[PDB]
Design a protein around this motif. Sequence first.
Motif, short mmCIF file in Angstrom:
data_model
loop_
_atom_site.label_atom_id
_atom_site.label_comp_id
_atom_site.label_asym_id
_atom_site.label_seq_id
_atom_site.Cartn_x
_atom_site.Cartn_y
_atom_site.Cartn_z
N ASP A 182 0.61 -4.24 4.07
CA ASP A 182 0.28 -3.48 5.28
C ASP A 182 1.84 -3.07 5.31
O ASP A 182 3.03 -3.77 5.54
N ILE A 183 1.89 -1.47 5.83
CA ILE A 183 3.02 -1.01 5.10
C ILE A 183 3.05 -0.09 7.10
O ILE A 183 2.22 0.33 7.26
N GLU B 85 1.47 -0.90 -0.19
CA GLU B 85 0.06 -0.53 -0.31
C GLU B 85 0.59 1.13 0.19
O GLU B 85 2.22 0.83 -0.29
N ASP C 153 -1.36 0.20 12.20
CA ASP C 153 -0.08 -0.83 11.66
C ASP C 153 -0.81 -2.53 12.08
O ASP C 153 -1.58 -2.47 13.16
N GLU D 291 -5.47 1.38 5.10
CA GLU D 291 -6.89 1.84 6.19
C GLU D 291 -7.73 2.32 5.67
O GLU D 291 -9.10 2.28 6.78
N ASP E 64 3.83 2.41 8.01
CA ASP E 64 4.01 4.15 8.27
C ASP E 64 3.55 4.59 9.36
O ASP E 64 4.04 5.59 9.02
N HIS E 65 2.98 3.80 9.97
CA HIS E 65 1.73 4.68 11.64
C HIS E 65 3.18 4.30 12.13
O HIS E 65 2.70 3.24 12.86
#
Lengths: 625, 633
Positions: free
Chosen positions: B94-95, B8, B130, B62, B97-98
């Motif tokens: 899923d990355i 993503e 995540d 998300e 990134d959060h």
Amino acid sequence: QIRYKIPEEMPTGSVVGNLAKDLGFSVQELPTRKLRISSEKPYFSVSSESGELLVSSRLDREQICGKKLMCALEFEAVAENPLNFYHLSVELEDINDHTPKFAHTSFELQISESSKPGTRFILGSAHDADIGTNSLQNYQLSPNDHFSLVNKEKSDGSKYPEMILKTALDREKQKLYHLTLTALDFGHPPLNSTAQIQVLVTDANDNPPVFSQDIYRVSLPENVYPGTTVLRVVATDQDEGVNSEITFSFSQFNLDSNTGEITTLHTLDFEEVKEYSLVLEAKDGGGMIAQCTVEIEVLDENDNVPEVLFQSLPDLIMEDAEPGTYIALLKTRDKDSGRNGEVICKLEGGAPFKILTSSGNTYKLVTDGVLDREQNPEYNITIRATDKGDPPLSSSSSVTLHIGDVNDNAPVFTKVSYLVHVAENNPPGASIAQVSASDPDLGANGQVTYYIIASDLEPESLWSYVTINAQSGVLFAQRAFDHEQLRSFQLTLQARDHGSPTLSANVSMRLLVGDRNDNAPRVLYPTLEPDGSALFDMVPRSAEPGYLVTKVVAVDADSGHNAWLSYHVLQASDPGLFSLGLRTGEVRTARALGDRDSARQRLLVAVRDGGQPPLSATATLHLIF
Amino acid sequence: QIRYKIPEEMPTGSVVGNLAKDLGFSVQELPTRKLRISSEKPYFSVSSESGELLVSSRLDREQICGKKLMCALEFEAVAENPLNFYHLSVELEDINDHTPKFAHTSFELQISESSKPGTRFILGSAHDADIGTNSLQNYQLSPNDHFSLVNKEKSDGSKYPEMILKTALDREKQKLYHLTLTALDFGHPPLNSTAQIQVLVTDANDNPPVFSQDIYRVSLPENVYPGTTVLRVVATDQDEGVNSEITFSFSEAGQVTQFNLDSNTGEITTLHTLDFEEVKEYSLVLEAKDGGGMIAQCTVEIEVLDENDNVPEVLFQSLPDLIMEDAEPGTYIALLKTRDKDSGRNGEVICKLEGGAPFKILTSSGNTYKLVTDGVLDREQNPEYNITIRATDKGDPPLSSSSSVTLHIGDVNDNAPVFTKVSYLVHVAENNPPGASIAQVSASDPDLGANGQVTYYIIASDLEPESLWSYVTINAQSGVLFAQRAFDHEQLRSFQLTLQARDHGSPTLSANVSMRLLVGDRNDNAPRVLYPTLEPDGSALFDMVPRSAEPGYLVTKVVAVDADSGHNAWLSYHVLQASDPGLFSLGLRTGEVRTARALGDRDSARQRLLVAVRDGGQPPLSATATLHLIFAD
Ligand SMILES: *[C@@H]1O[C@H](CO[C@@H]2O[C@@H](C)[C@@H](O)[C@@H](O)[C@@H]2O)[C@@H](O[C@@H]2O[C@H](CO)[C@@H](O[C@@H]3O[C@H](CO[C@H]4O[C@H](CO)[C@@H](O)[C@H](O)[C@@H]4O)[C@@H](O)[C@H](O[C@H]4O[C@H](CO)[C@@H](O)[C@H](O)[C@@H]4O)[C@@H]3O)[C@H](O)[C@H]2NC(C)=O)[C@H](O)[C@H]1NC(C)=O
Ligand SMILES: *[C@@H]1O[C@H](CO[C@@H]2O[C@@H](C)[C@@H](O)[C@@H](O)[C@@H]2O)[C@@H](O[C@@H]2O[C@H](CO)[C@@H](O)[C@H](O)[C@H]2NC(C)=O)[C@H](O)[C@H]1NC(C)=O
Ligand SMILES: *[C@@H]1O[C@H](CO)[C@@H](O[C@@H]2O[C@H](CO)[C@@H](O)[C@H](O)[C@H]2NC(C)=O)[C@H](O)[C@H]1NC(C)=O
Ligand SMILES: *[C@@H]1O[C@H](CO)[C@@H](O)[C@H](O)[C@H]1NC(C)=O
Ligand SMILES: *[C@@H]1O[C@H](CO)[C@@H](O)[C@H](O)[C@H]1NC(C)=O
Ligand SMILES: *[C@@H]1O[C@H](CO)[C@@H](O)[C@H](O)[C@H]1NC(C)=O
Ligand SMILES: *[C@H]1O[C@H](CO)[C@@H](O)[C@H](O)[C@@H]1O
Ligand SMILES: *[C@H]1O[C@H](CO)[C@@H](O)[C@H](O)[C@@H]1O
Ligand SMILES: *[C@H]1O[C@H](CO)[C@@H](O)[C@H](O)[C@@H]1O
Ligand SMILES: *[C@H]1O[C@H](CO)[C@@H](O)[C@H](O)[C@@H]1O
Ligand SMILES: [Ca+2]
Ligand SMILES: [Ca+2]
Ligand SMILES: [Ca+2]
Ligand SMILES: [Ca+2]
Ligand SMILES: [Ca+2]
Ligand SMILES: [Ca+2]
Ligand SMILES: [Ca+2]
Ligand SMILES: [Ca+2]
Ligand SMILES: [Ca+2]
Ligand SMILES: [Ca+2]
Ligand SMILES: [Ca+2]
Ligand SMILES: [Ca+2]
Ligand SMILES: [Ca+2]
Ligand SMILES: [Ca+2]
Ligand SMILES: [Ca+2]
Ligand SMILES: [Ca+2]
Ligand SMILES: [Ca+2]
Ligand SMILES: [Ca+2]
Ligand SMILES: [Ca+2]
Ligand SMILES: [Ca+2]
Ligand SMILES: [Ca+2]
Ligand SMILES: [Ca+2]
Ligand SMILES: [Ca+2]
Ligand SMILES: [Ca+2]
Ligand SMILES: [Ca+2]
Ligand SMILES: [Ca+2]
Ligand SMILES: [Ca+2]
Ligand SMILES: [Ca+2]
Ligand SMILES: [Ca+2]
Ligand SMILES: [Ca+2]
């Protein structure tokens, strides 16, 4: 180049000058070239149609050149086809648009009172923005007598005004001064600025505190309790502030420094210090001093008692003292003064004595009447001295006067006359009686002595008969007395004292001799022979009874019953023939004579006395018929 | 269908995969068919020139699947000429990134001090967007000694961390604690989140107020005015806030009120006047308590000191109202006690006698004194005494007490009556009337009462003791002498008397005096002639006298007597009358009648004479007599 001159603050759209005439460009040659003013700030502009210079922005010299002497702004003018530029320098004149003005509208200055005249004080110069003649030029102050104005100008233009003191200041005359200062420029027209200056004269300590009077006078009694407010002095200082603070100081009492009142701290006294002198000093903070004096006149109180001084003491005085003799010497003295020291004395009692004043505080005691020791021998006299204070103080003194004995009384016998009987045949040198005399006097004057002076007897035998004990008064017989020789005798005696002169008293005494039966009876008639016989042969035979035969006579040297003669019959030749008188002594016949009786008659009789025991004398009688 | 896998957050215009190779369409067969992705939202696009898949809109997992287990995006692909559709399912990864992050940067917790160890406290879990290994995995707390961290996951899938208390708290040791909590994910690489937790230990009432000492000691005088600050006590509470407020109170003691305590300040001041004679010591119990009923008590002992405010007292117990004058030296007269309410030198009392009376104090024991005689006494000199007794204590300043006793001295018969004169001498005229006062004697007796009552008696006389009553008597009360008969100087001239004065005491004291009484002579007896005897006419005859008698011839001699004495009996003989003057001579003293001259013839034979016997008394008494003398031849 070319130069133009205009005033600053010039309104917009005003012609500074035609550049077409000064640069040589025709009215038609001008629109071909796009005339444009080149400057950092667009103060100018060229309207191409008019072909002249015109003012654009406001020309503030004070914001551009400011203090610069000459304001020369050099701008440019650009013309195109052909490209050509011309530099133009414009000079503007300063306008008197900024009136002078001081920094503060009001600022106050505090100048001391003791500022010396001629001192220069600096003042802030006003700020005039213009330069040259339009700049500030004249400072002028209000005309008065206390301050002056001075201008100090250097070439640099940093000139300032200052105030010079004209006369010395005095805050007690005028506490403040308000003046107006004016700053003026030399423009057309001249415009001025006003500024108010208020000087408050600061106080200085040039006036000392001053008292109300140089000398004060107070009088107070000597019995004031500690703490009595004697006096308070007040001073005035002409200054204000701390320089006006007044402190008092001394230079038995007590002074408070701040209030300035003097009150006693101990009890006063007049006998030691009558008046006090006090010196007071008043001082401020700066050492300015002034002194005054107060005199306290303490008043004399009647607190000391007067004294009576005896100077001569007469322990013994004569009773026969004449009236008015000087007996004792007294003085009266008082430590006080005035009516408190004046003393009057008197004597209390009924004794005959008087006080006589000879001079001030000098008195003498004298007798007022005649005296006598026997009645009043002693006196307790009281004398009182009083002063004249209110109320007064008194003093009493007691003197004991004793009266002396003067020989004024003669000795007196206990009875007026004396009578003494003494029995006969007494032993010589024996006590027969005793006389006593009393003498009220004292000493030798009271010593009695008895003596014999006169007698009815012969003066030579006076010693041989009687004597006297002079000390006791007993009488002594110097011989055995005889009633037959002398019956009685008179005597006079004298009592005498041992004074000078002697006083005497005479007394009478009779001495009687008592009769004792010491003598036997003696026959007088008839006379007897040594045998004691008498013969009477002449008796009648024819005699009737009762015939007086004879009579016997007898005597006795004594007297009374001791001489009382009674006659008895011891023995007889014939009892009952003779009769005898028991008292008369007459021998007679008792019966008739008978012839039977014998011729010779014998008789024996005895003469007796009535004494105890009786003494008898015998006798014999022979009688013949 | 066909499936592709990409991550993503993929940038736009990225090749997901060539659909021409998986669907069997040539590079020239492709432009003929209008390949178009058909979906509700244009997440993808097909570039006809490229013939591959391309990302168009943002692919936010998300926002699409979120927490969904498997993310299968199902779109279609439409191709025209001939019309054919292909289903395409793409799965995105899923990355991470959060990064995990907690809700609040700082959150404070208020935990009680008395929290039991092992209690679990809730903490806010961080939110990691995540899923999977990239999700939050490790909760880790700062290493300390008071708290620990534990992760709890429930059946619902709601994971949370909680804090376990390790040891009991104590706000007086450390009022607060600040720790750092870290949230970590189990990805490559791991990224961390920090959150600070500050625990402020809430105050509890575990520390009581404590006094400085268990017992205090104060001493104060018994005369303090009400309101004197007795003492100040202070207590310390180790808490703060309301739980630190300290209130004082009286508890468990005698409720009698003489003191006063302020609750807040804690100072004790008197409320009434003190006194030592009733309560010697006071004991006070103080209670200090805070708001939560935590109490602590202390004690204070007040030892009141005895002040010299009570006056010493002198108690008389035996009263000598009557005491004998002959009291022996050192006899016990009066009984005294000394009492003082105070103590110490304030209770010690010394007594003394002031004055000149002869009495002394003798101390037999403490506060026991007796009065004794110091010298001999006398009622006649000093019958009454006022004795003053002073008792003083040893306080500063001392207090004294004076007491006055009135002692009376009795009379003892120790003085005999004394006459005013040693011997008496009184003259009494003869022929005095009976029962008349002749003299008076006075005796003085210094004693008092019956001992001073004098009485006079007659005891001895030179006269006959039986007729003494007939001679003289005495008034026994007044002492006057009364003559019981008319005295006769001729019978007796004088007489002696011995008298005695006696009092009416026990025993009786007597005094004897001697008095001689003389009878004054009066001329009351006339002289009487003894010889010669006279006839009733008073005539005596002496005849047969010779005429030739020589001068000096003793005719006779007269004898006479007088019963009196002195001048009253001095007989002198005079010649009253004569028939012939100068012819007869008489003895003025002897009484001898003689012839003075020769007898002449002219003169008669019978001669008559008249004489008188006189005495020297005043007036003189005379006895007359006539003498007849006859001559013969
Ligand atoms: C200092 O500045 C003062 C103010 O002057 C003005 O402001 C300044 C900054 C300049 O712009 C200046 O040009 C302005 O005028 C200035 O004081 C002025 O002094 C003049 C002359 O002494 C006064 O003129 C006299 O006025 C009185 C009565 O005036 C009433 O009104 C004025 C209002 O302007 C009030 O200010 C006054 O208090 C009064 O209530 C007249 O009675 C008098 O008459 C006489 O003179 C006239 C000539 O005009 C003759 O025709 C008559 O016959 C009389 O002989 C004057 O008109 C002026 O009032 C006064 N103004 C003020 C505000 O005080 C002063 O001169 C300046 N000093 C210097 C050195 O420049
Ligand atoms: C006390 O007696 C003497 C002597 O008395 C004598 O008899 C008198 C009556 C008179 O006549 C006196 O002269 C006789 O001597 C008297 O005093 C004396 O008198 C004489 C004579 O003048 C003289 O020389 C003496 O000094 C005197 N003596 C004294 C002691 O005075 C006196 O007058 C008689 N009476 C009294 C009271 O003393
Ligand atoms: C005082 O006189 C009385 C009375 O005579 C005396 O008492 C008696 O004296 C005689 C001596 O003459 C004794 O014989 C008696 O015994 C005495 N009687 C008593 C003692 O009761 C007395 O002694 C004389 N003196 C005093 C001082 O009283
Ligand atoms: C006079 O003084 C004497 C001095 O001792 C004294 O004895 C006497 O009693 C006094 N007089 C009177 C009347 O008391
Ligand atoms: C958090 O991660 C960074 C990245 O490496 C690291 O430098 C730091 O020390 C870590 N802090 C903690 C509390 O793990
Ligand atoms: C004793 O006191 C009484 C009454 O106060 C008084 O009458 C008396 O004179 C006093 N006696 C002496 C010796 O002080
Ligand atoms: C001498 O003695 C006689 C006694 O006979 C006393 O009478 C006289 O008084 C003197 O003392
Ligand atoms: C007279 O009396 C005396 C007394 O003594 C005798 O002695 C004498 O003899 C005569 O009788
Ligand atoms: C009775 O009277 C006589 C006088 O005649 C006094 O001498 C005696 O003392 C008593 O009073
Ligand atoms: C003795 O004297 C008395 C007077 O005293 C006469 O009265 C009497 O007659 C005689 O002569
Ligand atoms: Ca300007
Ligand atoms: Ca200007
Ligand atoms: Ca100007
Ligand atoms: Ca001055
Ligand atoms: Ca001053
Ligand atoms: Ca001044
Ligand atoms: Ca004095
Ligand atoms: Ca005085
Ligand atoms: Ca005086
Ligand atoms: Ca005299
Ligand atoms: Ca005299
Ligand atoms: Ca004399
Ligand atoms: Ca003889
Ligand atoms: Ca004879
Ligand atoms: Ca004779
Ligand atoms: Ca994402
Ligand atoms: Ca993460
Ligand atoms: Ca994600
Ligand atoms: Ca605790
Ligand atoms: Ca606590
Ligand atoms: Ca507490
Ligand atoms: Ca008490
Ligand atoms: Ca006491
Ligand atoms: Ca006490
Ligand atoms: Ca006695
Ligand atoms: Ca007695
Ligand atoms: Ca008696
Ligand atoms: Ca008679
Ligand atoms: Ca007679
Ligand atoms: Ca007679």
